[PDB]
Amino acid sequence: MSDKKTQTRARILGAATQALLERGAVEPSVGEVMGAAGLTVGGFYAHFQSKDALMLEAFEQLLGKRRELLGELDPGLSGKERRALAAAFYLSRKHRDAQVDAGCPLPATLAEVARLPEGFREVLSRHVEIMVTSLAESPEETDVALADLVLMIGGLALARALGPGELSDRVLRAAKQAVN
Amino acid sequence: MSDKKTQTRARILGAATQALLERGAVEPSVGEVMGAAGLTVGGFYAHFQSKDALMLEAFEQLLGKRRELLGELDPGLSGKERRALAAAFYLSRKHRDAQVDAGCPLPATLAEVARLPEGFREVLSRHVEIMVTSLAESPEETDVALADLVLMIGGLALARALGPGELSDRVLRAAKQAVN
Numbered sequence: 001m002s003d004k005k006t007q008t009r010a011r012i013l014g015a016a017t018q019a020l021l022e023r024g025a026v027e028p029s030v031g032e033v034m035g036a037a038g039l040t041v042g043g044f045y046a047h048f049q050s051k052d053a054l055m056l057e058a059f060e061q062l063l064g065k066r067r068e069l070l071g072e073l074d075p076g077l078s079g080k081e082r083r084a085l086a087a088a089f090y091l092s093r094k095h096r097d098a099q100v101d102a103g104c105p106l107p108a109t110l111a112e113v114a115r116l117p118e119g120f121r122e123v124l125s126r127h128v129e130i131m132v133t134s135l136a137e138s139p140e141e142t143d144v145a146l147a148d149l150v151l152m153i154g155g156l157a158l159a160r161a162l163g164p165g166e167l168s169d170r171v172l173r174a175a176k177q178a179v180n
Numbered sequence: 181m182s183d184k185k186t187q188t189r190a191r192i193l194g195a196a197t198q199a200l201l202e203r204g205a206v207e208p209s210v211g212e213v214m215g216a217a218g219l220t221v222g223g224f225y226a227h228f229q230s231k232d233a234l235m236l237e238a239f240e241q242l243l244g245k246r247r248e249l250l251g252e253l254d255p256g257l258s259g260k261e262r263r264a265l266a267a268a269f270y271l272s273r274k275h276r277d278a279q280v281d282a283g284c285p286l287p288a289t290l291a292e293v294a295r296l297p298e299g300f301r302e303v304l305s306r307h308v309e310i311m312v313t314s315l316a317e318s319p320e321e322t323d324v325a326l327a328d329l330v331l332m333i334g335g336l337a338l339a340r341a342l343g344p345g346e347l348s349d350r351v352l353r354a355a356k357q358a359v360n
Binding site: 023024026027106107108109110111113114115121124125128129142143144146147149150151153154155157158160161162163167170171173174175177178180 | 203206286287288289290293295301304305308323324329330331338340341347353357358360
């Protein structure tokens with residue numbers, strides 16, 4: 001039970017998050033997002049100040065959700081176990097193919113962060129810090145967790161670029177198998 | 181010793197490769213490239229059919245050069261040694277900061293490959309295949325080399341996104357240290 005204002009904003013942000021996951025923060029236009037929301041385009045600025053404010057919120061939301069998902073892992077798992085599980089969830093064909101409910105925006109957006117508003121870099125840095133801390137059970141595991149995040153984000157990025165097929169499937173497997 | 185046609189084309193491609201390394205293949209405009217070449221902009225189509233043909237050539241050239249550099253590694257090195265050396269050359273602050281002579285375009289471009297002309301994916305696939313084959317000394321090392329390439333490309337991508345600083349430096353180190 002809701003209302004049309006709340007619903008309409010949510011629809012716009014939903015279209016934005018989808019575009020961001022797939023095409024990053026630079027390419028998508030207000031026209032495309034509103035288009036994909038099945039909304040008239042004039043309505044945009046009643047809900048958001050700018051395209052960049054919209055995409056930053058989409059980015060923050062998606063990342064917050066990835067952190068929530070990681071929070072759902074069994075608290076009793078070792079560092080190594082949790083990292084293996086995180087890797088298996090991240091480095092899947094479904095995630096590669098944008099067929100998951102809460103995709104990670106990093107493969108699509110990392111290359112743009114340096115030229116985007118500072119909020120993107122700020123949220124990114126904090127996201128990495130929080131994730132690593134949660135995946136490392138001891139100070140010796142900090143670097144292992146960081147390299148594992150690299151295997152996840154990089155592995156998915158490379159696999160997606162290659163497109164569905166044997167090579168791409170092998171990239172996902174190899175990246176998963178190297179997680180420590 | 182050369183000529184003005186050869187020189188002018190080379191200047192255009194030089195500006196293109198630079199833009200590609202830093203900002204990928206989608207963002208840069210003909211105007212920006214010619215601008216950065218200190219050329220009048222009308223001259224473009226005397227040398228290239230389209231922006232996409234230019235960027236594909238820039239991409240192929242940069243990747244060919246990365247393969248050449250890897251070819252310069254001592255033939256007597258083990259698989260493991262060559263992978264460690266490749267990683268140390270790739271995962272540097274200078275490479276992160278676009279202060280190398282022959283940078284890798286993959287961090288900046290991977291996210292765009294799926295929506296670019298097919299030549300990008302084709303060249304990418306071949307590049308990965310050739311590199312892995314050259315870094316693996318036995319079939320068991322194929323997956324190790326692939327994961328190492330992921331640590332390189334992904335590590336540089338994440339470090340660049342974070343920008344200069346301690347966290348970014350740590351990403352480079354952690355990624356290098358995980359290479360096997």
